[PDB]
Point group: C3
Chain length 452, copies 3
């Protein structure tokens, strides 16, 4: 039989905020179990250092730049989204006989054609925008008050959740709610001859910082208020993963299920997170912004107790899942990742002599990153290109560009070459951001790929 | 049997320039007959306050902004047009067994793929551009003189008319010519088992101001020269409508034919028109620019002698005609109107708690309008957003924004939300307009949707 | 039987640099033989005054502007190219039973979908970018040194040649190498029931100026160093044409083969060329930049010893070849040329009362050209539109605009009309060129089509 696949994605999870990736203060035993009896990844990179584009990339297998999705969708709502001509991994799997489910955060389009149920997800339970308030007792009264005033543009963090299009009245803390529905999904899946795919998109530990008192009580030694709340949010995810894991064991699903656990981007230091030993955090092209924790777990298939030290991209998940599912992939889909399993099993670099990119736009310029073999190229804050031996210098403290001029110049030029089929953005997260984009003649790649 | 449908569209007809919509000086008895034995609309809105985009919207059922058609086509000619992937209502009806005809003004593309005969019209007789000179005795000598000089770029107002692609030598005043062919069309239609659709696009009373002496003689009390000519132009349309009506009765078509009569946009005050009691006129986002006269007539179906006081959009005609014809509509067509018939028959607002928009671009900024229930939001002349209780204040004299800040802000934000899937314009009416568009980083929606 | 077709294209060949088009110093007897027993063209125009766009136009039959290909591809590499939805003439011919081959320079896209083997060429031997170093003994050591350093972005002029996707180690001077493979191609073609199409794209006499000592020895009277080298480069092409011609005769192919020989654009005066009697050279909208030498040769079909004096466009080759091959052409392909054979055989103007355009972009403005009947309109160097009787004034010395105001204005307005379906460029030859394009709000057609 072909394996079941679960992709679990935390939102704004810091590099050092789970036990298996070095957390000395937050405790995540159920997630750590999956690590201990599976393989974790010390060099795992998402395709963009924040949510919308990173998630677009997970589902499509393409850098968000190639499909006009370089920015988060408009915060106050919109009728646009990740283009429909890039087939989602869920759609492909559904076409090769998988029962498909998506839970929690979407952030890839509110309209009918961009909805999870038209991107190849049989079941969906969650909220369509960038995040959500965690307590129904807080958020449902506010929404009711505003809808009765006649307002149509309501902040999406307080709007109702939905199940396959129809609104619901959620009763639990959201992290637990999604965990409950993850159980319900795998339970529904037992009564089918088909294998299953589940995209579990937790909004924790993303703002707003809201945790159950019961979870926070587990971290009495954490004296900082925001960090303690953050910790409780993360522990709530861990309880969920443990609850899912039990349901999988109960159903004899555990053994033929590949579980991936990761973050969508780096942690935000001002909102409770820790990215040790990486520099900076969310949104940055420093390692802190797009290098994330990740583990695979699949008994008798994924090695137990290993730590894989070569680069892996979130882009690889698409063709990798497809190869494991026996689903055909077409050359016209323009996948930017690679099926990493053959290299993974031989403990070899799946991106041997090949770059992994990050390009994030700012006001009138762009920050960039390149990861190839031991090297990390970095363009940030309008400075000249720096270069790091990232294997010796994970914190990016020692720029060795002066003694590798030819190598750095080469990497940047390859990025310049790669840039040409990037589409103009189909939207921006705010109206003024698009106005400034047009005003500044963006992209200003003359600044971005100038060399020393 | 499914009903025949006639859509009659005057060009630049003022709000107060037909008898049934309050004209004290111009007399339109045959059009008034249709009103008296049918229902007129006091709150009827086109999708854009001038021709090309408004007509694009009629045919496609979509706001012109969504399909890159926010501007009139180049005045001196072009090889572009209303995109071919938006199925015209004529095409849909033709596919559900209707005999289709288009007469008069097109203004939606000169090229073969944009031609009426490829947009689902079996018969077409008219001129493809923005308007035409009215007297063949004046215009045919000028065209002949210029073609013999060897000139290829001839002002489209003097070029020959055509019938299904072949040129003709028209003998009558154009308003009468089109009326004659409207008779010919419905006559041709009797000898078929099919019902029929007719889009009669009069160019009257659009410039240039040219009328028959016989028509002007009917308005001896009109002392102003331009208004008298204008009046004669409008009376000529009325004669045409009466002539069509006779032919329909002669053929036992009258009783199972829905006739819609309306304008493409508001009247232009400097070229003879009157928009009483509305403010401003053609091209404005004030009511005068996009609120137009309209009547439905269909015996034993449309109430006789009524005046419907709730909002209706030209966008509604597409799905409304389709529902009456029993033609299926697909979610992928992205229709922006609603089938208004169910609400119409119950005398309810078909756009209850839903906005009707107008957005018209200017040099480096945009004017806008929102109509929802009793409210009219207005952005004009780079002023702050104003708000009107349009039911009490049709002339837009009393801005009540200060005492409804939350409501106004809400409406504007919904318009901001709606703006995101507007395409960049595929053309402009002049070369400099596109240059200025690019220079000004348009759209400048940061100005257009800023709130107080 | 339908005829074999060979299209031979020199790169940067000057107007006066072959014997049959007036060369007093360079000697080209084998090319001259084809002229003497065929027809040469005194008014032959490519679609754009430099390589990439001109070649795109040859293959697609469309002005490069219509398909976003107005510029040369990025010099340092890219993953974009001539769009795949414009069917190449090679593809059409392959679909109507032709054995297809492409040799030498491509300059129309490095990626798999843009590769010659996916644009309808069975065989390809050459280099994919803008040109190449001529001596393997010089270029192969440099490439080997750089590949061993680990560099991935290597100047394309020193990279290996390829044969149907696999790299090769070429042993000869490139002009001779391509000539040898042209022989190999026509030889392979004998053993097939099919006729054949061959696109022989010499990079000579394009930079860098490198010739065999043996060739240069034939021009001892040429005292200038660059001109002597240039001459040797051109003689090497002539040897190749003679070698191909022998192989064709050997195989009884000569008599039922249409050979076309031409340049991709005008000669560059600073790199050895001569465009007498034309003004300026490569890249200009003066005649020197896009009026090129051309001959047809096809015994008992093309008249022997004639000089055809009416305009012909490179755009005509597509439908002309197609008509001779009996291959159907569709209206949806939007071909911008005409099948010129019927007019050619009657010694009539195939573009009678129809313009041939050239539009080349510069820093914040564009130069333009129009050729119709005896007239040449010219916009250059930000000057006002000039007009020339090009039949009496081939060097463009006598502007007669003042006494033909109406005619000039007409031509320009038709060009303005033609401009509207030009696509925004899908790429530029350098990063800064695209930045400057966006900064300058290009195209600035308000400057380009302003009239007096
Ligand atoms: O008092 S509040 O609760 O703060 O007020 C509320 C609103 O403020 C909040 O709104 C969201 C939720 O929490 C904060 C803010 O976070 C933003 O959430 C986005 C997703 O919804 C997004 O995160 S992402 O999805 O992982 O990408 C935002 O990050 C992005 O922001 C920009 C767009 O892309 C990047 C930025 O350019 C990305 O961030 S990055 O650069 O670090 O990568 C994320 O910030 C909270 O706002 S706060 O400023 O952080 O405090 C408030 O707007 C409104 O007025 O009131 C509500 C009601 O409570
Ligand atoms: O002709 S070659 O020069 O050999 O070709 C080259 C490359 O092929 C080689 O690639 C590596 C190095 O030598 C062979 C192959 O060995 C594998 O090396 C891995 C690291 O890159 C890894 O070694 S490890 O680091 O000690 O772990 C592999 O071992 C692991 O494999 C499984 C996963 O964990 C263990 C196994 O269960 C671990 O093995 S262990 O028991 O030793 O601990 C190791 O196999 C050689 O390839 S070949 O397979 O022998 O053919 C080629 O990939 C590259 O593209 O080109 C070069 C050209 O020089
Ligand atoms: O003696 S003249 O008639 O003036 O000489 C001729 C030309 O002038 C005329 O050109 C047309 C016909 O009559 C006047 C002018 O009207 C324009 O017609 C357009 C359609 O072809 C269009 O109307 S529309 O279709 O209902 O929209 C024009 O309105 C638009 O204009 C701009 C583009 O979109 C809007 C504007 O931004 C829209 O108008 S709006 O802002 O009110 O909404 C309409 O003006 C007449 O010109 S005049 O200026 O009205 O006097 C002349 O230019 C030419 O050179 O020569 C001919 C022949 O002699
Ligand atoms: O000087 S060298 O020692 O030779 O240095 C070398 C490199 O410089 C060279 O680079 C190329 C090859 O030879 C010269 C230059 O020629 C350019 O070739 C292009 C195609 O590869 C193109 O020709 S084209 O394809 O027929 O069009 C260039 O012309 C175009 O350039 C722009 C894009 O479109 C136009 C321009 O806007 C078009 O020119 S046009 O307007 O005249 O039509 C053509 O210039 C040589 O450069 S030089 O300036 O002549 O000296 C150097 O870059 C590299 O780093 O090293 C080698 C030496 O090892
Ligand atoms: O003062 S001098 O004696 O003239 O100095 C000399 C050198 O400067 C000159 O170098 C060239 C020849 O004429 C000027 C300059 O032109 C530029 O050449 C570029 C490549 O060599 C390129 O030409 S192109 O490839 O044919 O296009 C430049 O054009 C491009 O620039 C932008 C990027 O793409 C386009 C632009 O957006 C393209 O322009 S285009 O679209 O119009 O094609 C072209 O400007 C001359 O420079 S000067 O300062 O203006 O005089 C000097 O560098 C050297 O050191 O010395 C010699 C004398 O010894
Ligand atoms: Ca996030
Ligand atoms: Ca009008
Ligand atoms: Ca060239």
């Amino acid at each position: 039989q072909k394996p079941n696949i679960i992709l679990i994605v935390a939102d704004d999870l810091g590099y050092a905020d789970v036990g298996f990736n070095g957390s000395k203060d937050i405790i995540t035993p159920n997630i750590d179990d999956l690590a201990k009896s599976g393989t974790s990844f010390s060099d795992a990179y998402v395709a963009h250092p924040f949510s919308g584009p990173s998630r677009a990339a997970l589902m499509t297998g393409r850098y968000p730049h190639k499909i006009g999705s370089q920015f988060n969708l408009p915060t106050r709502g919109s009728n646009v989204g990740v283009p429909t001509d890039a087939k989602f991994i869920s759609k492909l799997l559904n076409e090769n006989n998988y029962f498909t489910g998506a839970l929690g955060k979407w952030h890839m389009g509110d309209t009918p054609q961009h909805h999870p149920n038209k991107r190849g997800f049989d079941e969906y339970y969650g909220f369509l925008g960038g995040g959500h308030n965690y307590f129904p007792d807080q958020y449902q009264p506010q929404y009711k008050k505003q809808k009765a005033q006649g307002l149509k543009n309501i902040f999406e963090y307080i709007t109702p959740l939905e199940h396959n299009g129809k609104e619901v009245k959620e009763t639990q803390y959201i992290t637990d709610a999604l965990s409950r529905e993850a159980v319900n999904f795998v339970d529904k899946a037992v009564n089918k001859k088909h294998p299953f795919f589940l995209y579990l998109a937790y909004n924790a530990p993303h703002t707003p910082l809201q945790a159950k008192d019961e979870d926070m009580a587990m971290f009495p030694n954490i004296k900082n208020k925001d960090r303690k709340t953050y910790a409780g949010m993360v522990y709530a995810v861990d309880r969920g993963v443990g609850k899912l894991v039990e349901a999988l064991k109960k159903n004899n699903q555990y053994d033929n299920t590949l579980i991936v656990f990761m973050s969508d981007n780096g942690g935000k230091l001002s909102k409770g997170a820790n990215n040790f030993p990486l520099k900076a955090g969310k949104g940055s092209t420093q390692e802190g912004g797009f290098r994330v924790p990740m583990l695979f777990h699949w008994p008798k298939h994924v090695p137990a107790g290993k730590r894989f030290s070569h680069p892996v991209s979130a882009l690889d998940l698409y063709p990798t899942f497809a190869a494991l599912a026996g689903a055909k992939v077409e050359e016209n889909q323009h996948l930017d990742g690679t099926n990493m399993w053959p290299a993974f099993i031989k403990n070899e670099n799946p991106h041997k002599d090949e770059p992994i990119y990050a390009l994030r736009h700012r006001k009138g310029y762009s920050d960039a990153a390149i990861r190839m073999n031991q090297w990390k190229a970095l363009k940030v804050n309008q400075q000249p290109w720096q270069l790091f031996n990232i294997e010796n210098d994970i914190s990016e403290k020692h720029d060795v560009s002066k003694s590798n001029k030819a190598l750095l110049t080469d990497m940047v030029r390859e990025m310049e070459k790669w840039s040409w089929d990037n589409q103009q953005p189909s939207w921006f997260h705010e109206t003024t951001e698009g106005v400034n984009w047009r005003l500044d003649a963006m992209p200003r790649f003359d600044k971005t790929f100038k060399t020393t």
